[PDB]
Amino acid sequence: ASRLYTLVLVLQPQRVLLGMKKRGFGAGRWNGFGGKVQEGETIEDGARRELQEESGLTVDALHKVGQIVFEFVGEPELMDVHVFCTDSIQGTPVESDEMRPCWFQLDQIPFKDMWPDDSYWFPLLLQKKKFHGYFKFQGQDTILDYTLREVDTV
Numbered sequence: 001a002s003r004l005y006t007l008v009l010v011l012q013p014q015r016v017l018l019g020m021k022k023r024g025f026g027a028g029r030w031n032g033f034g035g036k037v038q039e040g041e042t043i044e045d046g047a048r049r050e051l052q053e054e055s056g057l058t059v060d061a062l063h064k065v066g067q068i069v070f071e072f073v074g075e076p077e078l079m080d081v082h083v084f085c086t087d088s089i090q091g092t093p094v095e096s097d098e099m100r101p102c103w104f105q106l107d108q109i110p111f112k113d114m115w116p117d118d119s120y121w122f123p124l125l126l127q128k129k130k131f132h133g134y135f136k137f138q139g140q141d142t143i144l145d146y147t148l149r150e151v152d153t154v
């Protein structure tokens with residue numbers, strides 16, 4: 001089967017907010033904010049909760065921009081990551097136990113220090129296109145297979 005995750009990108013006209021993950025899965029890489037969706041909350045509410053937990057930020061509106069499915073070799077559950085974007089945020093981002101936030105100019109996104117799949121689908125995010133992606137990983141650095149397409153409905 002698969003398990004629901006969220007990822008939130010705060011994308012403003014000339015900059016994008018990322019967080020350096022300080023512990024847990026994916027520590028040492030910049031990423032959007034998010035995590036597992038809990039029983040009893042919608043996917044979008046889980047995305048808002050994780051954004052607040054990791055950054056302190058709240059948002060007026062979250063927009064669905066993508067879905068990415070991950071297979072990790074030897075792991076039974078696929079990860080079904082629902083990706084959201086927003087321009088307007090409420091608050092100034094602050095460091096949490098999990099994330100250290102930082103703004104990046106759109107031509108200085110730190111892909112070499114992000115999950116490798118981001119290099120593939122982040123351009124579509126920046127181009128405001130909706131997308132469906134699938135990435136097969138062995139370990140945390142090697143993409144074995146992938147698919148990526150633009151979609152009309154996320």
Ligand SMILES: CCc1c(NC2CC2)nc(N)nc1N1CCN(C)CC1
Binds near residue numbers: 034
């Ligand atoms: C570990 C899955 C993953 C990812 N690809 C990994 C397969 C290589 N790439 C990005 N940008 N985020 C990812 N997660 C989504 C949910 N987050 C909250 C945590 C991290």
